[PDB]
Amino acid sequence: LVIWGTDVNVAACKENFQRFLQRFIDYMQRLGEINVIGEPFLNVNCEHIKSFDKNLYRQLISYPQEVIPTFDMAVNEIFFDRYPDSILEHQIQVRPFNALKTKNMRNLNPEDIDQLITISGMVIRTSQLIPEMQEAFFQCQVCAHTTRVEMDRGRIAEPSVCGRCHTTHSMALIHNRSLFSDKQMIKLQESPEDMPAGQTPHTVILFAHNDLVDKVQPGDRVNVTGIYRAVPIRVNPRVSNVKSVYKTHIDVIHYFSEKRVELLKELSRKPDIYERLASALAPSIYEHEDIKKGILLQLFDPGTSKSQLLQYVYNLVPRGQYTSGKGSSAVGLTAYVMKDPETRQLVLQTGALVLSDNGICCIDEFDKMNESTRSVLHEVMEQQTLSIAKAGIICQLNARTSVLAAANHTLLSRFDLIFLLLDPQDEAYDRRLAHHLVALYLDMAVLKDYIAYAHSTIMPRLSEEASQALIEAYVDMRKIGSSAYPRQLESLIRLAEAHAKVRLSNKVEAIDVEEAKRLHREALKQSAT
Template sequence: LQPLPTSPAADVRSPNVQDSSLFSSPARSPASEFDVSSPLTYGTPSSRVEGTPRSGVRGTPIRQRPDLGSARKARQVDLQAEQPVVDEIVTSEQSLGQKLVIWGTDVNVAACKEKFQRFLQRFADPTAKEEEHSGMDLSEPLYMQRLEEMNLVGEPFLNVNASHLKAFDTELYRQLICYPQEVIPTFDMAVNELFFDRFPDSILEHQIQVRPYNALKTKNMRSLNPEDIDQLITISGMVIRSSQLIPEMQEAFFRCQVCAFCTRVEIDRGRIAEPSVCKNCNTTHSMALIHNRSMFSDKQMVKLQESPDDMPAGQTPHTVVLFAHNDLVDKVQPGDRVNVTGIYRAVPIRVNPRVSNVKSVYKTHIDVIHFLKTDEKRLHRIDDEKDQKLFTEERVEVLKDLSKKPDIYERLSSALAPSIYEHEDIKKGILLQLFGGTRKDFSHTGRGNFRAEVNILLCGDPGTSKSQLLQYVHNLVPRGQYTSGKGSSAVGLTAYVTKDPETRQLVLQTGALVLSDNGICCIDEFDKMNESTRSVLHEVMEQQTWGAGEAGIICQLNARTSILAAANPVESQWNPKKTTIENIQLPHTLLSRFDLIFLMLDPQDEAYDRRLAHHLVSLYYQSEEQVEEEYMDMAVLKDYLAYARIYVHPRLSEEASQSLIEAYVDMRKIGSGRGMVSAYPRQLESLIRLAEAHAKVRFSEKVENIDVEEAKLTNQPTPRVSLKS
């Protein structure tokens, strides 16, 4: 009898084992073997995988397990026997199929496959939201519709919601959470058999891989402990850094330098087991590694930081290292907020790379199975192709009907920050900032690029809701960053060079402005920011890039972000006896880069104070339903903004162009008689961006005079600061 190993990693398979009937599906011939795979390290597709449903299609990518090489088969033991099942005993699946499980688990392969196929064929969720399953019949089996869609699209990945699995079969869900290394490959076999039985003529890039997500065993990053090792978990956070693509060897190719005999060796637990003796000529130490004949897979290291909502008071954010493989590489970028589903790993640290001794303290990481971007309460991203498919024809018709209403501009602005009293003009300006202008790229003609982002500065007395407006915008937009002027440095806003703890190489760590690319960066206490920190904003606010040249790293980073800044006057209170420039005291070069500057003053008026107090008190005694009835639904506002930013790209008409020219000339005339410059060409570009944004509000592809007039009105609440020439 073969001794029972003490751990799955010590399992040694007898070379004489050929019994594959124990791992076959009840509906298929016993020729199908259960290849112990891992849902983690996706390797190069191998044609040597046997038992595939279609021999003409490339095999499933080798999903190696760190503890068991993919060349070994899963060992099974009899739960009802005191001794482990002898490998040489020939046993039929009918007699012992329900008793045999993979060693170290309670997973029976045949039963697990049968349960999962039943789940795919029967599960339906009539109570699901239509937004989650757009274009699908909720009364029909959900995942069978997904397989039909997969047959048409050709993407060999099936995302399975773990909460659906728990609602259908609690025991199968428990096995998935506790033994993902064994269960997920079993799911792969089950879905491939079901798919190719239903669509025998379908051709995919490789066989279907199941990706579970939304595991109910969701852990806070701080509460991860040794009990979670090798289990399926889901955590949330924000991506702060992603490494470059790293090639990881999956299969080594050796050739004898004496007789040219060639052999392939699977990578076992990250080690290359070099053959010491050639099997052909018995020469020792003659095998040489041939790199260009070896098989590699893509790998990327991603660093995930704890989200502010999950942090205890007074604590610094925690980080965790993620490893993404193959098609998951470059799925997320720094600044994305994601839910990560994967397997929690612990890896020993060697005392010395040349010695096999390891420390008692282990390093942990997560091998990623699924990324889910979580911005449900935020706007859709412009550059996300998936978000461009969210709008059904019915939803588009509703949005277009809404855009034809004459008061749509006022309705949208009143839906922004409804808890803040009045400030309608400021809300309209922020609304235009959310829509943005039309980005124009004339680099191929040598005229450069023209930014579409609108920058806004809020300046005024304390207690006028400046910070609340910033917080609201930060919570609304994706890739939004919030920072304070006093606590920010120049490198913290842009990027800085640091040493990678994994590779010990110098890498560029991005800051708030770069992380908010294609978003909005909210900067509070702008007046308290020192001069050296404010100087980095000049390039970002106009050229939308930031050039880095430090420690041998020379690059140009995209920072296509809108700036929403809030500042207090010099004396903390606005002094009406001083001019605007004396109250703000910001450099002229920086002020000219703001498209809109709003003054938020606290008037000394009894009637205004009474209305404001009534509004504040009503926020406490009114219920949420009463408040929501008065304003537009946030889901409608989110979709309206997203559709306009993605699909509406207005261009200037001839009449609007002439109106813009006249408006710019009038702005220049204001200070010409006193020998002062009241407007720069940047202010003309600001008017163009504001007019384009107002055209987006109407879903219009053409900028008309009404848009130019509204842009001029938006620019009037605070007259453009006069700057001496």
């Protein structure tokens, strides 16, 4: 009752499994989730046998279409005999989880026709549920009696068979097991890891048959290990000619360092840390370093080292979007929902500002925008969220992120921070330009880890002594030498959290106490006169 053409046993370790039971016992959460919860779709991890033996791993990726069913049938069959009183109606499919990251994701060769591969990117657009017919059966003429034959997988329900006897929709939908399946068109965008900007980035069509659709949230980071497939595209629907080009698509199947940190605290107590970090961090930035306060603290003539300053953010943190007006209308930034008239299917378009959560967006030339736009940002600035109200969708999209820029009636208070570039009219300052940049113009890994790993656990707390300090500050000094009365000052506590985020210090010392005080004087001058 088995064919030897593929030479696949049950796990290839049935004889090794008996001694595995008596030797390995002599990570509990993996075993216990199965027995107690009874959760389907077993979610086994990376193939760790590849560390032990490569041959066992190499045989589960060459023909994975013939391997996944083997794992599914074997695991279920054992439970059926051991546990006859379990739920056999809900099939369980063993799924690889965080499989091998295919080398040179950029260079996906066509040679690996049918193998698991791991793409890494983002989700651009998602399609509405597209039902499909699965396990189709035919209709006989002899008393309309159907015998179960197609139980074994491997048949293909080719189209154009139901252009006669359309009763199959009403009649054979349920009785011949022809219920519609689920599939979702998904377009990922490969992340070239700050490529030198050579070749264009490849698009991938992720739309496979598996019914796990939307149990993984779109609009996140992509770590979907999938199975490559190729299908012949018809040249014309009218004829049967097929061209010798196939569309790629990917199957949906998915569900020392700390020593360095301690060193930074020891050198932190030195009183020359301010000059050392400012000089070394972002050295490509020219004069007018008061602007750096927004950048340096928060991250860790127009375009006069200004637009370039934005380029640093785009270069430093790839998480974000850079855009500008005067070339895009209000609908050009988001809520661009549109359908394709050639294929007659709707697309629920989104926008970049929507995708801008957990980042900083680069928008400049804000004064040149029209009054029709700037509406969506206004809620974001005043409600920290982005609501999209169109006929299809009425809700709010999370905007738990910060965006800042700079400028050049008193209803301006909508802005978080306002700074004006003043001209000291000092020719000596420009002199440093030629020597600083023109004359001058492994470590990259170190700068990357600072944000992701260290900042993940750090959460400052405000002591009792450090709160009232700003409150008592503005009241007394405001009448000496002659708007502060709003609660705008209190909001400055948000940026105060940056002081503690330096040195990873949850405690407050003499450093960063007078630093917050002078910030009032810098804001006072630009609001004076």
